[PDB]
Scaffold this active site. Sequence first.
Site, PDB file in Angstrom:
ATOM      1  N   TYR A  52     -14.771  -8.826  -2.301  1.00 58.52           N
ATOM      2  CA  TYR A  52     -15.512  -8.692  -1.050  1.00 58.52           C
ATOM      3  C   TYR A  52     -17.016  -8.572  -1.310  1.00 58.52           C
ATOM      4  CZ  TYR A  52     -10.949  -7.894   1.162  1.00 58.52           C
ATOM      5  OH  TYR A  52      -9.658  -8.035   1.629  1.00 58.52           O
ATOM      6  N   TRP A  71      -8.781 -10.218   5.404  1.00 59.37           N
ATOM      7  CA  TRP A  71      -8.058  -9.020   5.766  1.00 59.37           C
ATOM      8  C   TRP A  71      -7.849  -8.838   7.277  1.00 59.37           C
ATOM      9  CZ3 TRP A  71      -4.812  -7.715   2.403  1.00 59.37           C
ATOM     10  CH2 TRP A  71      -4.150  -6.473   2.429  1.00 59.37           C
ATOM     11  N   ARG A  72      -7.239  -7.718   7.624  1.00 63.64           N
ATOM     12  CA  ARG A  72      -6.657  -7.495   8.926  1.00 63.64           C
ATOM     13  C   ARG A  72      -7.673  -7.225  10.044  1.00 63.64           C
ATOM     14  NH1 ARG A  72      -5.960  -1.449   9.130  1.00 63.64           N
ATOM     15  NH2 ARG A  72      -4.261  -0.948  10.571  1.00 63.64           N
ATOM     16  N   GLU A  81      -7.497 -11.959  -2.271  1.00 61.54           N
ATOM     17  CA  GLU A  81      -8.252 -11.330  -1.185  1.00 61.54           C
ATOM     18  C   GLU A  81      -9.725 -11.724  -1.242  1.00 61.54           C
ATOM     19  OE1 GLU A  81      -7.798  -7.097  -0.084  1.00 61.54           O
ATOM     20  OE2 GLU A  81      -5.715  -7.142  -0.796  1.00 61.54           O
ATOM     21  N   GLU A 122      -5.375  -4.563  -7.334  1.00 63.20           N
ATOM     22  CA  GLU A 122      -6.693  -3.926  -7.468  1.00 63.20           C
ATOM     23  C   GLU A 122      -6.640  -2.683  -8.370  1.00 63.20           C
ATOM     24  OE1 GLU A 122      -8.441  -3.458  -3.526  1.00 63.20           O
ATOM     25  OE2 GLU A 122      -8.034  -5.539  -2.988  1.00 63.20           O
ATOM     26  N   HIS A 125       0.848  -1.198   0.000  1.00 65.31           N
ATOM     27  CA  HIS A 125       0.000   0.000   0.000  1.00 65.31           C
ATOM     28  C   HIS A 125       0.884   1.248   0.000  1.00 65.31           C
ATOM     29  CE1 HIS A 125      -3.159  -2.896   0.865  1.00 65.31           C
ATOM     30  NE2 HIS A 125      -4.054  -1.945   0.661  1.00 65.31           N
ATOM     31  N   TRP A 179      -9.469   3.320  -6.540  1.00 66.90           N
ATOM     32  CA  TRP A 179      -9.348   3.762  -5.146  1.00 66.90           C
ATOM     33  C   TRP A 179      -7.885   4.002  -4.736  1.00 66.90           C
ATOM     34  CZ3 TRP A 179     -12.605  -0.105  -6.879  1.00 66.90           C
ATOM     35  CH2 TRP A 179     -12.094  -1.420  -6.879  1.00 66.90           C
TER      36      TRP A 179
END
Length: 450
Positions: free
Chosen positions: A245, A319-320, A279, A172, A110, A177
């Site tokens: 997601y 995810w986290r 993911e 992604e 990221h 985004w």
Amino acid sequence: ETIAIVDADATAETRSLLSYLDGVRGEGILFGHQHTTSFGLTTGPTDGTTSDVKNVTGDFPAVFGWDTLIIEGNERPGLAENTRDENIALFADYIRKADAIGGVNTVSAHVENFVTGGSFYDTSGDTLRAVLPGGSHHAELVAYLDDIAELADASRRDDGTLIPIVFRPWHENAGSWFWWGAAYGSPGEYQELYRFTVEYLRDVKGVSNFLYAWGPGGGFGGNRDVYLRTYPGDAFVDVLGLDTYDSTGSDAFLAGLVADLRMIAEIADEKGKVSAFTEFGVSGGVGTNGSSPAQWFTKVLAAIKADPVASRNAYMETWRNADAGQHFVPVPGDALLEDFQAYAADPFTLFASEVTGAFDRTVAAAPAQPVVHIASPADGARVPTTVRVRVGGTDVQSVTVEVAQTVVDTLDLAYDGALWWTAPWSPSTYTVTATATTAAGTLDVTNEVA
Ligand SMILES: [Mg+2]
Ligand SMILES: [Mg+2]
């Protein structure tokens, strides 16, 4: 066994991992969790040895996910007060601990907005184009990649053995985004970003423990043309991914998901590569700021298992577990806890203790595929400049470039001593064709530029 691997001179353990990941497909899917031992809601203060997943299932995930935000000091174990070098030492420590537990390590990036000083979510600055070869902020990407190479080299077992890492940069990108997304560079500009990243790490820095993952997003409806629009190429990607997601749990969702999962499995089978569900999760997570779609985990798994092609995917990472508001693995108080536990107990999902023979295989690399691409100007880019051509996987005698609009310019390039063959160029739609005379024969490539 002989396998197609991006780094043809990767360590024995790294080629073994890619072999293992392909062989596990259709037999079992490794469960993954981001920051599994560094962020938790049931762990107490973290030290790289405890996990919410372990605490609620009795086993660590088979895949430990991490991020270069650790290097930046923006995510634990990294600290903002620390230097990047001590953050790297902490990062390598956590990878070492994951490996000792028996898990597989993956690392996403990221990346901070170099132009604005903002986050990966700041999409202003024209940062993608600025960090490309010839870009105004290119040196900053180079510095950032040096830190990643440093982390790769620090990621060693006690005996000195390099721990294999699945590096998943620029993910992604079919969405917008992130500043490296589809609205901030042509498919060709993205491709040169990804190719440069691989080439810089593998060829300039000599990183030998990386597998390269590429996952442009999700929700492609099984459309290969849309999915492969930004595909960096066979010489640059080991693992084809998918990031999806959902919070509906609907039949429509599961059908679209299965379509995408069989798509990536087919493509990987054809190419002799690995595919993975890079993911997955409930949108917004399963916490107070997320959703609890009924039996979501077991429904997703059942949909995958019911399909003999969709199930040919090596791992699936969620995810986290940041806080009560935002976490992805359910903990006591979450309606989805029992369903996740059921998902975890399913014999098809594999956890740390079930990972065996991942790193000790004897497998040979297929020889590196010879490639040529024009690093600048990238395909789809808008254009005095420098034409940069990369020729990899072979000895090169000459590189010539023809600019056409009828041919309007012919350039003879010179090797720069490190990466590119280059020449000056002083330029409504140009065609830029590079031709390389090599020990593997004649190679060429055409970029179309405005
Ligand atoms: Mg090497
Ligand atoms: Mg299981």
